[PDB]
């Protein structure tokens, strides 16, 4: 009976951190927009997705209430803290110091940002993602910090 | 030539089950489904 | 130093197709887009679409999608746009044009959206 | 698609503007914001870019502006060298660019 | 009867900040038994380890986990070292501190 309702309903999880080859060297309107369209484009709405991340666009329903909004910061925070520990803290793009290994994706460069949308990207890059996180904070991030530490 | 960068905003969606919570038109305290301890729904 | 030089003027019957070229020089053809505009007779200028001609990555305007295939030779430096499917509506001086920087990809498209050099363009009458 | 008006008209010396409406997903959003000239029989050349700037060539008489949902370009000393159609462009919301419908300038 | 299964565990609490003198103005804890410094070029698994019976007792869990790791982003902060790793804030070191 609740089926016939919510039939038109997906719930889904917002992976707001992306990583994609560039060539640097380190309103709620249209908050998942560009989700269907190609990178690049998808990288001008930065600034609506990442804000309402926090937001958003009778004991039970209030433990439910206190869950969502637990929940909802645990991930907000757990994206923010990949960005400080990336060095990434308030920039929305952050070029970053790691250099791009072919062998996690060799698309030219222009296929993944004028053809490739963030979904196909995400669905490629998924068994990568870690190992570029991982070279983002082992490797480049605590080494610089390290290094403007030389004084 | 290629190096990472992170973008924070991307949209970029995994399935997902969460624990979701009640939104309401306007508040029936003795509702069976109360509709009190829901936040308001936007105007729109 | 911006040449973009066009082909001549077609005369096409509804339902037949035809190719535009624009051939350019002056700057390195890989590291701009060409963009394609449509100035009918009469009336308001109607953006046709761009090709991202390192790769060779096209996009369109909602009411040019699959009635049009942009498409770029690298070895003579030029950007064919083939119209098909024509209608009487279709009668417009067709431009090519050169955006204002370089794109940096997935960084600043700020320079993609000025159209800097335009080219002399060329009817086409149905 | 992008809302221009169809014609403007002042005497010479006049200061007038020129508006361009679209959404918030298309000029409210986005900074990319450009104004084209075109001369009756002419090839169309670019007046202003990126809201406010100007390229190399085009005098400041053409300063552009933008505020809310609302784009426009400001003429300040019309003269019968400006008599030309004017074009509003802008980034649309996802890999499209819209134009206006072209404003028919005249010097009275 | 469960002290003779967890005789060889201990909780322990992650202090993820810390200060050190310095000239200037391995998953999870591994290296925590090597030197200071080397120490330093493994401070990020730590740091991504953090906002890693009853419903009620594992939102306590989490809502102490988030309020630990905001306390110490608030440390951070209200010190000019949000975001760093490594900051160094130009206060000496006063010789009596070891
Ligand atoms: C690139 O990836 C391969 C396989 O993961 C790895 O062996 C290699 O070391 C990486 N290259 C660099 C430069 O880190
Ligand atoms: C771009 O992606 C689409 C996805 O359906 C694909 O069909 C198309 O061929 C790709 N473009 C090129 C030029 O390969
Ligand atoms: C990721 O690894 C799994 C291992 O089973 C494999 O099936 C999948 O195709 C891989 N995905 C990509 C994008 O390489
Ligand atoms: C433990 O001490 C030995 C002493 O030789 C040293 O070689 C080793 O690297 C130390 N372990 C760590 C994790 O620093
Ligand atoms: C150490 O701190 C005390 C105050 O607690 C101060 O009086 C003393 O001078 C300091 N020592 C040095 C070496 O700065």
């Known amino acids: 009976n609740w089926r016939s309702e919510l039939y038109k309903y997906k719930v889904v999880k917002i992976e707001p951190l992306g990583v994609a080859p560039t060539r640097c060297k380190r309103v709620s309107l249209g908050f998942l927009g560009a989700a269907g369209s190609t990178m690049g484009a998808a990288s001008m709405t930065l600034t609506v997705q990442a804000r309402n991340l926090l937001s958003g666009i009778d004991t039970h329903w209030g433990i439910k209430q206190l869950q969502a909004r637990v929940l909802a910061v645990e991930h907000y925070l757990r994206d923010q803290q990949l960005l400080g520990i990336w060095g990434c803290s308030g920039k929305l793009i952050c070029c970053t110091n790691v250099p791009w290994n072919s062998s996690w994706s060799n698309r030219n460069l222009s296929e993944i940002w004028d053809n490739m949308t963030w979904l196909q990207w995400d669905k490629e890059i998924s068994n990568y993602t870690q190992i570029i996180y991982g070279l983002l904070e082992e490797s480049q991030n605590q080494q610089e910090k390290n290094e403007q530490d030389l004084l | 030539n290629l190096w990472v960068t992170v973008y924070y905003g991307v949209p970029v969606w995994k399935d997902a089950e969460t624990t979701l919570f009640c939104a309401s038109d306007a508040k029936e305290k003795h509702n069976v489904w109360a509709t009190h301890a829901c936040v308001p729904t936007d105007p729109n | 130093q911006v040449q973009l030089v066009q082909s001549g003027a077609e005369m096409k019957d509804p339902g037949a197709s035809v190719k535009v070229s624009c051939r350019a020089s002056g700057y390195k053809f890989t590291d701009y887009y060409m963009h394609w505009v449509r100035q009918a007779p009469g009336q308001g200028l109607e953006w046709v679409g761009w090709?991202?001609?390192?790769?060779?990555?096209?996009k369109y305007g909602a009411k040019f999608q699959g009635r049009v295939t942009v498409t770029r030779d690298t070895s003579t430096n030029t950007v064919f746009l083939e119209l098909s499917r024509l209608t009487f509506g279709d009668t417009a001086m067709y431009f090519c044009?050169?955006?204002?920087?370089?794109?940096?990809?997935?960084?600043?498209?700020?320079?993609?959206?000025?159209?800097?050099?335009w080219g002399r363009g060329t009817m086409v009458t149905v | 698609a992008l809302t221009q008006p169809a014609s403007v008209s002042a005497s010479p010396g006049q200061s007038i503007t020129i508006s361009c409406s679209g959404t918030r997903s298309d000029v409210g959003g986005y900074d990319f914001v450009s104004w084209y000239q075109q001369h009756p029989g002419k090839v169309p050349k670019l007046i202003i870019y990126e809201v406010t700037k100007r390229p190399s060539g085009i005098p400041q008489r053409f300063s552009g502006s933008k505020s809310g949902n609302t784009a426009s370009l400001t003429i300040s000393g019309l003269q019968a060298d400006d008599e030309a159609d004017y074009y509003c462009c802008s980034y649309a919301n996802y890999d499209k660019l819209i134009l206006g419908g072209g404003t028919k300038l005249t010097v009275l | 009867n469960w002290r003779s299964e967890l005789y060889k565990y201990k909780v322990v609490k992650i202090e993820p900040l810390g200060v050190a003198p310095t000239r200037c103005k391995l998953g999870f804890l591994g290296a925590a038994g090597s030197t200071m410094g080397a120490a330093s070029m493994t401070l990020t698994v730590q740091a991504r380890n953090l906002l890693s019976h009853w419903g009620i007792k594992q939102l306590q869990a989490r809502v102490l986990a988030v309020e630990h790791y905001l306390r110490d982003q608030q440390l951070l902060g209200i010190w000019g070292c949000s975001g760093k790793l490594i900051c160094c804030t130009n206060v000496p070191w006063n010789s009596s501190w070891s």
């Open positions: 090709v991202n001609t390192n790769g060779g990555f096209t």
């Open positions: 044009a050169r955006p204002m920087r370089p794109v940096s990809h997935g960084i600043d498209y700020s320079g993609l959206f000025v159209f800097q050099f």
